[PDB]
Amino acid sequence: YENPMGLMGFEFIEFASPTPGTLEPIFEIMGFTKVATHRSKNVHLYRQGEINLILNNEPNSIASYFAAEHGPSVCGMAFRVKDSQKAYNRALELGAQPIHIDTGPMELNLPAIKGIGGAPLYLIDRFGEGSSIYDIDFVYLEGVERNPVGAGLKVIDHLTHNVYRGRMVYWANFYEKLFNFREARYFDIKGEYTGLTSKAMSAPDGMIRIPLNEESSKGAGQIEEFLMQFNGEGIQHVAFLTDDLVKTWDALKKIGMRFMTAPPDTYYEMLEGRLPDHGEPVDQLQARGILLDGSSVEGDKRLLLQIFSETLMGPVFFEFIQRKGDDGFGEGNFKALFESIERDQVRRGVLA
Amino acid sequence: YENPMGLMGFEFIEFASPTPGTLEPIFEIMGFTKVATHRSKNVHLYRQGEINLILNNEPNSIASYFAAEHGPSVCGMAFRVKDSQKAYNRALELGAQPIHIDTGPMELNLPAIKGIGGAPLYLIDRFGEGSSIYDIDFVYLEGVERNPVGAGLKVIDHLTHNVYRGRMVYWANFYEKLFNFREARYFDIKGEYTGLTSKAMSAPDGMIRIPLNEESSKGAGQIEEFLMQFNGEGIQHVAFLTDDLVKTWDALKKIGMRFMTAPPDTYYEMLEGRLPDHGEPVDQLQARGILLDGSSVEGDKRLLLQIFSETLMGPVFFEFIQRKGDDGFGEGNFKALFESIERDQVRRGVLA
Amino acid sequence: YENPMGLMGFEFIEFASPTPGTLEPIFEIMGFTKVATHRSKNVHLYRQGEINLILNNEPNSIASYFAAEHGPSVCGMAFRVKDSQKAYNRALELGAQPIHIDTGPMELNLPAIKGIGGAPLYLIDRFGEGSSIYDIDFVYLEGVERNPVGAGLKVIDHLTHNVYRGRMVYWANFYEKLFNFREARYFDIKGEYTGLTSKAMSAPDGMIRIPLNEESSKGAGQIEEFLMQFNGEGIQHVAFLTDDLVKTWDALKKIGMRFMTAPPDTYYEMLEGRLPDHGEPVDQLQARGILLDGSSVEGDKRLLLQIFSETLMGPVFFEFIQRKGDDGFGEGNFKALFESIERDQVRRGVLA
Amino acid sequence: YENPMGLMGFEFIEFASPTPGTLEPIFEIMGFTKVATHRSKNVHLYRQGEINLILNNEPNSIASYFAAEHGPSVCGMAFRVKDSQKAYNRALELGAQPIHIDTGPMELNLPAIKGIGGAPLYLIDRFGEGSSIYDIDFVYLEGVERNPVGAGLKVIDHLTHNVYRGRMVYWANFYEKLFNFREARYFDIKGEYTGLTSKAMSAPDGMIRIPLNEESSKGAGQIEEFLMQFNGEGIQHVAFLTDDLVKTWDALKKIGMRFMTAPPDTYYEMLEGRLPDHGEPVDQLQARGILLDGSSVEGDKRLLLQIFSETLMGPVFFEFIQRKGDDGFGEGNFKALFESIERDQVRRGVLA
Ligand code: EMC
Ligand code: EMC
Ligand code: EMC
Ligand code: EMC
Ligand SMILES: [Fe+2]
Ligand SMILES: [Fe+2]
Ligand SMILES: [Fe+2]
Ligand SMILES: [Fe+2]
């Protein structure tokens, strides 16, 4: 697939909250470590593997207005590009809206366009060696390890957008026209009482992936609850890749992670019928509540293991995923996740 | 009611569209005349009575980005205030987000904050005589009458906001906190198959009024259909005051106005039951499809006459109102409006 | 004479000083009254007749930086123009360097270019009729008379520029090229020990006149002394037109004005020789030290009456002039002014 | 000596011209090589040893207005500091005037204040390895040697400021107050008909040195000539250090350098009388026109070898210097330089 913006994956995710001390604990429970402090702003860098999470507590700024609206949330998203000048000019030619971010003496002039819910989308062409943006804009803490391993999360795998009815098409067009993303798959998920629809959008770099979710015709489901609780469209869950989910599970549990309620025993009993010869240790999945899906087509096994945290920032939750030959998404996991969140809505008295 | 910003009424409404030549004919059909052109931008002043409508076709600006998103629409609103510097500074202390608008040589530096759907909310303290803002920022057309009467519309009476489920509270708070509006009345309107809920918000000047509308629990109605068609929250209808609605209705009709479908004969038959001694010429109302409402309490009659155009700007429609003692809104008129739009939904095949 | 920029006279002169309370007393001793205070800045409006003098005590601004360098001085100058947008854009196409001035809510965006010594040159197209720039940017003092008469000064007649050797040509070019001024007359003035050279530059409106002064080959004179005491090129004296100089002289005297030392009695004895039939009351001139000059060509008498204060603002001095048919300058008066300042040098010990 | 600004030497010098292709040849004759091109502006990097010379040909900027006024010249100067935030803040607290420079996406925000004649003075704290400003803001040419040796010029030694009469004190205070420079020496140089006065200011880092030059009482000399031809105050000559002047002379000669007329034979005949035991090969210096000075105090020899280029950019000339134990300036060399420029004045017909 052609890549006109020269997209080379996710660079960083940015966070903001109206209440001081609410994001720090979250990041620590998820295995992240504070590693540097911006040189003139009140913004901090948290890291795990190659994941860069930016904590922005800058007063009177884009981030502080965004957090007064949405609560604790993802307030920015940066993609890596080959050439920021070229990619920023191309996006303005194609109709994107520019966002100006102020900087101090000797800091970089990072370009950005408006994205989901007003959150900036940054186009960064300075990464990896020599000097990354963090080497120039930030000051590393005295003595800290600058590349912590944490609980094994490596890179950002994918993130979702929960959108109002009729806007799945709008956000598909945004990423199709500006970045040449493509609809890799379409889902129609039904729970016991409610349901949803989704389009899994993939970027041409084969790294950035963004599932776009919208409520069903019925209404009363989890997508509509998100939209009310977040006060608009936004990133509903962020997913981190790991090379070994059970091991990561054990490490997150030790430090305070809170996962979703596991599926019933029935689910684990039907795995072999559904995925003949998967090969995974059912005993270890079922003890942890891990979901298993993918295909088994004449010897060729492509699997997907997924597990979700409870909501931790307003309505936003996180996901720890391990791919074994499957580069897409799976309908059974999606359905399990969906039934889990629907039971919680009954539990809480908000549905039927 | 206390007025801490020193509000003094609406100053102007601003409109944009992505296709050139779509707004001119709508203004012309409502009785407005073009009277001036801005001195450096591609923006035009349309007037009737004391109503000032600004047509903004300035390329690569706030208004062009807003119209690419929403279609023909209301992209800006200005309020009259006693001292712009004090009101602007008090907004900014109470959390409002400032919006910067570029200006050329010798033009006014108009202050604004972000409002409904991102549309700027201006805070103007130079009006009336001596020089208004149109005297300084616009050049009147050679020989045109600078104060046209048109079809009789006088001032902007009110305008609505159609919001997403759960956001009526959000917008009520925005106006209560920054300007001290108050909820003057609550409505719960039910059609044949659908319904809505609304809060009529009143500013402390007794001039600015903004009903806030949201869809019912059942969904599928007209508010949800506006949100999808508009691509977000926005001003659903703008109402203009007239001192004589049957005369304004005849004027409007001559120059092409397209009004909604009238109520059935049954409605006009029940008027005397419901409003004993109203004193209005039923024969005139009924042939035009005008709606009559208010109260008849012990000889004190406080009436409201309303009529609505078809949708003219995407899903946005306009209202022509005459007040005869009633300063608020009427439930019976709200119902008939709602039932009429509901029947149109059924006719277009979008409802049940 | 063609007028491409639409010049229409002087609009205002701006002053600054590094010591608080040094300019106030000098304005009051020349007949000016404070009449308004800016709406957001620490800047005050001083007025007499149609002369507007702006006292700028704005901290951390162009004016504060300029006064730190030069001492009490003229830091700005504004010209009236027909259309600011056209004039400003023509200036920028002919190489003029733009100067941005910040402004608060609802204030005018005044365009300016760099002029003598970096002092901004404003281009104002809003004067007289309806609302001036003082009506929009300033708040008049409770109950003070908005148009005071003072001591009879009416308008700014002219103002000089003292320049470095070789820069008369440079400043003549600047005004010729941008506004089409012309060299109306050239002077070569010699004292007892020193001398100077000067180009009287005239604008195409018949109102703005700027004499440009430079030191002679000999050096050690009064222009060189100004340039060291002022710390650069700048406006050396500002002249105010009056319709009656002996009356203004009496008024100025009563409020504290200090005038230069008078010419010796010889001067007044030779007036008839030099200007047969001048017709002026020699007895009144001689008792006040007024200078008289011009021509007497076969009946046609074009006279000039001039008087100069002592230096009041570092090396800057002021002039009170009455024109009786002569629209230019006089060589005899220039010489007497020169000889008087030369004797002052000798008196202070700085010359020979 | 205390160093409050944390000064650590010169970082770069910047040049502009109104005529294209006038600076490229000058740099090439002086042994410099073009090594990179800015990533978004029309600015180019030239290098020799640790010397970085920036060629700024960016339209409608500070540089293009500065060049229209002064002709080919030094338009910018950058010092190295430990912390640009701290140094920039300290300089604004002490009265310096800020200068804003526009930058593109992912470029550094370089801070600067106003210096000699308006030319910016940059405060850069990013140098040496990791990434210098050139690694971030520029794009190295494909295949070129990034660190060329040229003719041996190592670093910038010093540079002068020619100032108007009475401004030696002004510029002395500027550097004393902001950066704590000190007057290391004072010269009073007389030629045959004219003379000058000078203060050698030294920075506390013992690297930055700036001799300040002003015309004598007599007038008509070479400083006054510079001021007219440059159209104001500015950098009259820039000096480059070399470890071997005779070998640098030979390589400069080869590629096109034009040196001043050497001193008469008489001057070399007297060297031994004035500097007993200097030890330098007089044959090699006299054939090349190199100037020799310093001291010979009981065995301890501190020498200075200097040679000057003809004027190459308007009235600006260059110096190639070798220090042999003398960290200051020499009065004989200054006098010989002065006599040489004076004779050229007589040759050209501008003096007596
Ligand atoms: C600076 C936008 Hg989170
Ligand atoms: C520029 C606001 Hg429609
Ligand atoms: C702000 C010009 Hg004196
Ligand atoms: C870009 C200033 Hg010479
Ligand atoms: Fe996911
Ligand atoms: Fe209405
Ligand atoms: Fe004068
Ligand atoms: Fe030198």
Count of helical regions of chain A: 11
CATH H level of the largest domain in chain A: which superfamily? 2,3-Dihydroxybiphenyl 1,2-Dioxygenase, domain 1
Secondary-structure element order of chain A, N to C: EHEEEHEHEEHEEEHEEEHEHHHHEEEH
Shape of chain A: globular
PDB class: oxidoreductase
Keywords: Oxidoreductase, Dioxygenase, Iron
Assembly: tetrameric
Entry title: crystal structure of pseudomonas fluorescens hppd
Q: What do these coordinates show?
A:
Chain A is an alpha+beta fold. The first copy, chain A, folds into 2 domains: 1-150, 2,3-Dihydroxybiphenyl 1,2-Dioxygenase, domain 1 (Roll), CATH 3.10.180; 151-352, 2,3-Dihydroxybiphenyl 1,2-Dioxygenase, domain 1, CATH 3.10.180.10. Helices cover 27% and strands 30% of the residues of chain A. The first copy, chain A, is built from 11 helices and 17 strands. In chain A, the strands form 3 sheets. Chain A has an 8-stranded mixed β-sheet with strand order 6-7-5-1-4-3-2-8. Chain A binds chain D through residues 39-40, 84-85, 88, 103-111, 123-126, 130-131, 135-136, and chain D through 39-40, 84-85, 88, 103-111, 123-126, 130-131, 135-136. The structure holds ethyl mercury ion (4 copies) and fe (ii) ion (FE2) (4 copies). Chains A, B, C, D: Fe cation binds at residues 158, 237, 319. Chains A, B, C, D: Belongs to the 4HPPD family. Chains A, B, C, D: This is 4-hydroxyphenylpyruvate dioxygenase.
